[PDB]
Design a protein around this ligand. Structure first.
Ligand code: 4T1
Ligand code: CA
Lengths: 250, 55
């Protein structure tokens, strides 16, 4: 996160840290005790599928305070339409081997219904983006969970306001074109959370952009509203041997 | 009905035949008798921050 602030411990309780061989890989969002939403591109270079760990209740990477909960990732579900090394359909659904225990520090973000997200949540201007990604383009990543409040744009306004891949119907633009504030590559898979009448909802996933906080460019986020039914059906299914699963989309 | 201001629902809205509207809530919530508001049924409902809810 560039130009944000430290997220006070426990104020982003749905934030997930994904690790491969103990090394920081990506962010994610807890949506219930078993399921995490992340970005499909996060898994393009994975070979050790059995060493994926999701950490809930994390805040500070240098210290263990006892609020952290670790779970092996049992399944990584990606839409059939996503092509590794590209931008479109950038979503992954992760099944934890065992449920996490909800506490003051571990709480899921609400996965909204599609119509409500399209008709109401899409029009709430500001939302929060969070992660332990880069504090600067080509800079060090954060040791403490960072958070940034970003305004959403209509794709027509985004294209007009920007100085390259296409911004599809499965994406949305958010942030600023003045190079001051943005989510970065290390925040990939992290939540774009929208507040509505006392409750927070998952509206987007940190996806892609042109260098962190580059002037003339906004951050691009996966439009979660397009995947609600795909996610709901998959969450009702039994797991399959092998961690990676390509599931048909729609 | 649902198309205008989420049908007055705090969370989810469903249209029915005629003038009928039903509000619904996410799991971990129940609908209040006003037929529009959602109240937690659990200690850690989704999308609420406990440290802020407690203070
Ligand atoms: N808001 C934001 N502003 C500026 C830049 C941003 C960059 C982001 N992510 C990086 C990232 O994750 N880089 C490692 C990586 C690993 C595996 C696959 C790919 C990238 N994919 C590509 O390079 C080919 C698609 C295009 C693509 C380009 C960059 C990215 C992801 C996808 C995320 C958010 C950003
Ligand atoms: Ca820690």
């Amino acid at each position: 996160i560039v130009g944000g602030k430290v997220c006070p411990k426990g104020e982003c309780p749905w934030q997930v840290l994904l690790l491969v061989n103990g090394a920081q890989l990506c962010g994610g969002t807890l949506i219930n005790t078993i399921w995490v939403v992340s970005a499909a591109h996060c898994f393009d270079k994975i070979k050790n599928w059995r060493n994926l760990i999701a950490v809930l209740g994390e805040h500070d990477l240098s210290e263990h305070d006892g609020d952290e909960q670790s779970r092996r990732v049992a399944q990584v579900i990606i839409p059939s339409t996503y092509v590794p090394g590209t931008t479109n359909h950038d979503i992954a659904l992760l099944r934890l081997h065992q449920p996490v225990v909800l506490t003051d520090h571990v709480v899921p973000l609400c996965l909204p219904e599609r119509t409500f997200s399209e008709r109401t949540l899409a029009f709430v201007r500001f939302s929060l983006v969070s992660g332990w990604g880069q504090l600067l383009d080509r800079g060090a990543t954060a040791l403490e969970l960072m958070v940034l409040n970003v305004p959403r744009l209509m794709t027509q306004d985004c294209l007009q306001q920007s100085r390259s891949p296409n911004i599809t119907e499965y994406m949305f633009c958010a942030g600023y074109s003045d190079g001051s504030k943005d989510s970065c590559k290390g925040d990939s898979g992290g939540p774009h959370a929208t507040h509505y009448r006392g409750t927070w909802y998952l509206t987007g996933i940190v996806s892609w952009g042109q260098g962190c906080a580059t002037v003339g460019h906004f951050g691009v986020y996966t439009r979660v509203s397009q995947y609600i039914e795909w996610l709901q059906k998959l969450m009702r299914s039994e797991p399959r041997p092998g961690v990676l699963l390509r599931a048909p989309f729609p | 009905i649902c198309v205008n201001e989420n049908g007055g629902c705090e969370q989810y809205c469903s249209d029915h035949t005629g003038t009928k509207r039903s509000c619904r809530c996410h799991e971990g919530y129940s609908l209040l008798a006003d037929g529009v508001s959602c109240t937690p049924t659990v200690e850690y409902p989704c999308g609420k921050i406990p440290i802020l809810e407690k203070r």
